[PDB]
Amino acid sequence: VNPTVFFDIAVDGEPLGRVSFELFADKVPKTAENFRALSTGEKGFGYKGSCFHRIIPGFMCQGGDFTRHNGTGGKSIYGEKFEDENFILKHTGPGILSMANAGPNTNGSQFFICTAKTEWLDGKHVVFGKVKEGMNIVEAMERFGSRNGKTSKKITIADCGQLE
Amino acid sequence: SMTEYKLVVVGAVGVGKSALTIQLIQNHFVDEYDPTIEDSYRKQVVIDGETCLLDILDTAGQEEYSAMRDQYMRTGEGFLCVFAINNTKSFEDIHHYREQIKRVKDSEDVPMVLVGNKCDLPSRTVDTKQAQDLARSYGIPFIETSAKTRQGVDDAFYTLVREIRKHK
């Protein structure tokens, strides 16, 4: 049974709402496990408190740098980086959850949520989940973004964990 | 008002386009890698006694979006063509950037400067003579730089302004 995790999103510290994700442990178990563990914080570190540093309307919301909080950092539960598990799943449309990277086999903790189909990322970023509930929260996050991704308010993961 | 110069910084991923620009604008060195989407900066300087306003477009080196460079090449007045002296592929990528700029602007005469960056590192794979000969065949200046030590940073951007002045 694929796990489900949640983010409680805040905007300059004020609550916005909850987004939940199904993680495709049945297709990308190692990548889903990394995101699951970072969402519970069970290794002593993870997504809680971190921000969405890059939001580009029409494309995606990107976050997950909990080590440097500036979009350059992040780390996996396996080490600083880990390999591309597979590219079976595609960036088919809004709600797709996929790993950010700086080239082949550089997955850490940064991730992005698609707000449109981004098919040219297929075979370069590992898709491993999708928004289950709260896509309207992701839609609402877009207006705090901009052409180059700079955000006009601080969009943070106020709380996060695994749902039963 | 002072004359404005539209400078555009181009080159392969990781050669130091942003580190050079941020050194120019903010006088410090970014050690971490923050991959660029697109950033714009403004700075006034004095060059050869004349005060002017630099408008700098710091571009992404991502090969995936090479088709989308044509629009900022249309707008730009001069191009800082950056490679890293320890990255021979980035030196080879220079030809494709210059060819793309010439094609987009439909001119053999576009203000450009060749910049070999990271000259503080000991792992040099592109010889100074190699880059100097390439720049001579293009008819443009060649400047060696380090965003880390600041060597040549002002010189690279100011030389590009002088190239635009000679063209205009």
Ligand SMILES: CCn1c(-c2cc(N3CCN(C)CC3)cnc2[C@H](C)OC)c2c3cc(ccc31)-c1csc(n1)C[C@H](NC(=O)[C@H]1C[C@@H]1C)C(=O)N1CCC[C@H](N1)C(=O)OCC(C)(C)C2
């Ligand atoms: C040409 C302008 N440009 C554009 C672009 C592209 C288009 N089209 C392309 C497709 N056709 C069909 C239509 C037109 C239109 N408009 C723009 C933008 C709005 O024009 C300003 C993009 C982009 C991406 C990078 C650099 C320049 C870029 C870049 C720079 S590092 C990168 N990608 C990958 C990025 N690594 C990291 O962060 C590393 C640090 C961490 C560890 C990464 O894992 N992710 C996740 C996936 C999304 C990606 N970030 C990102 O942000 O994509 C932005 C997007 C807008 C989706 C694409």
Ligand SMILES: Nc1nc2c(ncn2[C@@H]2O[C@H](COP(=O)(O)OP(=O)(O)NP(=O)(O)O)[C@@H](O)[C@H]2O)c(=O)[nH]1
């Ligand atoms: N030693 C040294 N490192 C440098 C120098 N210039 C840049 N770097 C380093 O090289 C890495 C990439 O630099 P960056 O300026 O981001 O390169 P870029 O060309 O803008 N990359 P992109 O095309 O993704 O936007 C960073 O770790 C940066 O600190 C330099 O002169 N010397």
Ligand SMILES: [Mg+2]
């Ligand atoms: Mg850059």
